[PDB]
Amino acid sequence: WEGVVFTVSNESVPRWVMAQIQPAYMGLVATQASLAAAEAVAAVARRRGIEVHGPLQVADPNDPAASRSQVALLLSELRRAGCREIAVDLTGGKLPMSLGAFMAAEEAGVASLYVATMRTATLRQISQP
C-alpha cells in the first residue's frame, strides 16, 4: 500500500500499521476526544517522510455519515496528491466511525483493512435500505 486513511482512537495501532506497510501518504480522521492521538500519529509519520493529510474531525462520532464524508474527502485528497494505491484501516474509533469509513471505502472502490489483536444508551440507526 502507497496510502492509508486511518480512523483514529488510539495512536499505538496506527503506528504499528505504518511500520508494516510503509506507505507514502497517510490520512487521519478523529473525534474531538481522539484528536490528540491522531496528532501523535501525524507527528511520527511526518518525521519518517510520509505526507500526512488531516487529522479531520467528526462533529458527531455516533453518526456514521459524518465519518463517511470525512474519509471520502481524504480518499480524494490522497488521489490528488498522486497516490494510486490507497486503503482504509478502520480499526480505530467507535463502531459508527469504522462503519462510516467502510462505507466511504466501498463507495470509492478501495480496500478496507483491520488489525486483529445503560442509562446513557440511545438506540440509533446506522443504515436503512
Next chain:
Amino acid sequence: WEGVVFTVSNESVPRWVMAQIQPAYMGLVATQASLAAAEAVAAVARRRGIEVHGPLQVADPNDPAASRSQVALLLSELRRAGCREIAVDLTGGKLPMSLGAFMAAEEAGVASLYVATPDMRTATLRQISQP
C-alpha cells in the same frame, strides 16, 4: 421492529434493546467465547413469548465473511417464519463481526442499528473488502 438479529458479545446490551423494541422474533449470532451470554439472552427471550433463532456460532470472529453468512442465514430464516420488519443490531462482538453483520443487512435490505453509550506483541493485518 418485529424482528431483530443480534451480534453478541455481552448479555446486558441485547437485553436492553429487547426491552426497547419488544420484538416478536429474535436472531442471535455469537462466537465460542460469547455463546453462553447469547444462550442467556435466548433464555430470557423465550420466556417472554419471543420466537428465538440461534444462537449460531462463527468459527473465526476476525473473518467478516463468517459473520455475514450466519446473520444472512438468520435473516432468511426469520423471514420464512413470517417476520418481515427486521433490524440488525450490530453492537457486540468485535469489529469484523459487526461489519459482517452490516454487510449481510445491506444485502438483505434490512436496517442496521447500534447502541451508542492494547497489546501489539502479536497482530495480523487483514483485508476485509477487496473491491
